[PDB]
């Protein structure tokens, strides 16, 4: 105590003691119980697992989703919650519903439809949106807002949403659109664990592991296992192989059992994007990794291009006079090309032909006479994401000696 | 802490603990009694006594 007598050291021993860290932004949306002490329909920042039950009630689906999200990540993310009020082997291995609606029919009506993202979360750009409901209207509203986040009209907040579609083969295969913004997990009819727990675990693991290095596909026993989720051993497959092939050919995130409790396991980390505009199977936006690559590449290019704001640009004219701090389009194109080359291996493949894949044009030469305005520039770039491992196709032929 | 705030040199015992033998004193906050600028409050340019000797 004689060392703490002075004011030099101020010791504050306490169990909770939240640590510093901003991490990665994830938004979890779920219903709340009346026991909680939080403002409904308002995004809030949750700091630890201890006080989630106080703020969001006891046994609420949002509280359980938060428990799973904090379970699957020690450090690296900061979780935001969107509490919602209810409309006016039991459970998991760790364990009349407490939340009214269809959310209680998945145990082994009337659901609120907010449609107020444009006001509750106005300009806060979130990476992963986690939804804890199976209502088609709520998921469609979330999809519409996330699609509106990618508009050429206004600055974007790139993100991705995670949902689940519990049901039989017919039901899940009918709740599927061309929404590249949603990854539709397809749980079976007799799935033991409460679906929103697995949905939250999937979304949290995805954001938590990728968004730092946003190109790691969530596949395989080393990258696509939901360790926190546990379920009892069984000898009944969730789907038949024909059904699994149909779903994987129809843009659904099919999960599998890692056959005591066995942690679940994923097969394909793809989005619900099959058809391009009008038609055509555009494989570019199939993998969820390509989405994060596009977002990160856009953001990084935007940050890099900010150095040209306010610089004098000598189009047409002549060479830069000595002492000036200006530039001309050719040197700008060269710098852009070098920046693109420097990011090979982390954001792009090598290239097809960089002399054609990147082109910088002044506004004068893109618009007719008297239409071109000085200062504005047009930049066009087509990139190729890195190649990653896939099927092995072993062909084994025995032979005697 | 109140004495620390208003420019006073606080001294304490080296080892408080309990009874026993004598203990040497122990000083803090080697500062001067300078709290105000010519008009304004926060003039820290002469708070620490080290700044005085440094300036001289």
């Amino acid at each position: 105590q004689d060392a703490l007598s002075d004011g030099f050291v101020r010791l504050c021993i306490d169990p909770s003691l939240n640590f510093f860290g901003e991490g990665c932004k994830i938004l979890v949306e779920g219903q709340m119980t009346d026991d909680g002490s939080a403002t409904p329909d308002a995004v809030t920042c949750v700091t630890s697992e201890l006080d989630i039950i106080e703020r969001f009630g006891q046994g609420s689906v949002l509280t359980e989703s938060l428990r799973k999200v904090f379970c699957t990540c020690k450090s690296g993310v900061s979780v935001y919650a969107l509490p919602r009020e209810d409309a006016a082997y039991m459970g998991e291995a760790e364990y009349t519903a407490r939340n009214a609606g269809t959310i209680g029919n998945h145990l082994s009506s009337v659901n609120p439809t907010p449609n107020d993202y444009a006001t509750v979360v106005n300009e806060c750009c979130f990476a992963v949106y986690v939804l804890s409901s199976d209502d088609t209207d709520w998921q469609e509203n979330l999809r519409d807002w996330i699609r509106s986040a990618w508009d050429c009209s206004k600055p974007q907040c790139f993100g991705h949403g995670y949902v689940f579609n519990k049901g039989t083969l017919g039901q899940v295969l009918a709740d599927g659109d061309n929404s590249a913004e949603l990854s539709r997990l397809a749980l079976p009819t007799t799935y033991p664990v409460l679906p929103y727990l697995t949905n939250a675990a999937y979304g949290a693991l995805s954001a938590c592991s990728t968004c730092n290095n946003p190109e790691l596909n969530i596949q395989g026993q080393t990258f696509g296992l939901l360790s926190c989720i546990n379920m009892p051993e069984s000898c009944t497959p969730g789907w038949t192989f024909g059904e699994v092939t149909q779903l994987q050919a129809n843009g659904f995130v099919v999960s599998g059992p890692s056959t005591n409790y066995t942690s679940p396991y994923i097969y394909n980390d793809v989005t619900n994007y099959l058809r391009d505009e009008k038609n055509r199977p555009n494989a570019t936006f199939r993998d969820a990794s390509s989405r994060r690559l596009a977002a990160a590449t856009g953001v990084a290019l935007a940050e890099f291009l900010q150095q040209f704001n306010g610089l004098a640009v000598f189009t047409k004219n002549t060479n830069i006079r000595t002492g000036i701090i200006g530039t001309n389009p050719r040197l700008m194109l060269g710098k852009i090309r070098k920046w693109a080359q420097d990011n090979v291996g982390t954001l792009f493949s090598e290239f097809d032909n960089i002399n054609e894949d990147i082109q910088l044009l002044t506004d004068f030469e893109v618009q007719p006479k008297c239409v071109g305005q000085p200062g504005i520039f047009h930049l066009n770039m087509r990139y190729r994401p890195p190649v990653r491992g896939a099927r092995i196709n072993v062909n084994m032929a025995p032979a005697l000696f | 802490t109140q004495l620390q705030a208003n420019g006073f040199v606080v001294s304490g015992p080296s080892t408080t603990s309990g009874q026993g033998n004598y203990t040497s004193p122990y000083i803090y906050n080697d500062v001067t009694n300078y709290l105000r600028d010519e008009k304004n409050r926060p003039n820290a340019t002469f708070r620490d006594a080290s700044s005085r000797r440094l300036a001289a």
Binding site: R321, G323, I324, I325, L331 | -
Partner: protein
């Protein structure tokens, strides 16, 4: 036109590794008719016996003699700063260098300095029509 060997623009950006302060890109001027020289291939071969070569990793150097600017400290040209050079020739060729370092500072009189710049790689722009 076309057949004209010479440099048209030379832009240098100085970054201090201590304070992360950025100066540039300031256009510069040649002191004489000696053009800047380049070495793009990052591998330096070596003559072994009977057609064999010893490929070992090396740098992409750059010798750039320029006229000092009076607004930039002389130490910035002699290894006490990080230089990002970008030179455009009369025929459209553009040499781009980034995060280079002045490896061998040579004593200068205060107006004309020569810089031996070492970087990981150098980008060439190859005016339209290639391969």
């Amino acid at each position: 036109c076309n057949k004209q060997n010479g440099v048209k623009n030379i832009l240098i950006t100085f970054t201090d590794c201590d304070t992360q302060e950025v100066i540039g890109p300031i256009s510069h001027e040649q002191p004489d008719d000696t053009l800047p020289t380049y070495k793009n291939c990052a591998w330096t071969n070596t003559a072994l016996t009977n057609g064999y070569v010893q490929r070992s990793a090396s740098n992409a150097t750059m010798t750039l003699p320029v006229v000092r600017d009076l607004r930039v400290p002389l130490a910035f040209y002699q290894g006490c700063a990080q230089v990002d050079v970008q030179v455009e020739k009369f025929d459209g060729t553009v040499m781009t260098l980034t995060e280079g370092a002045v490896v061998e500072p040579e004593e200068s009189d205060g107006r004309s300095v020569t810089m031996n710049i070492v970087a990981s790689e150098i980008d060439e722009l190859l005016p339209p029509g290639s391969l």
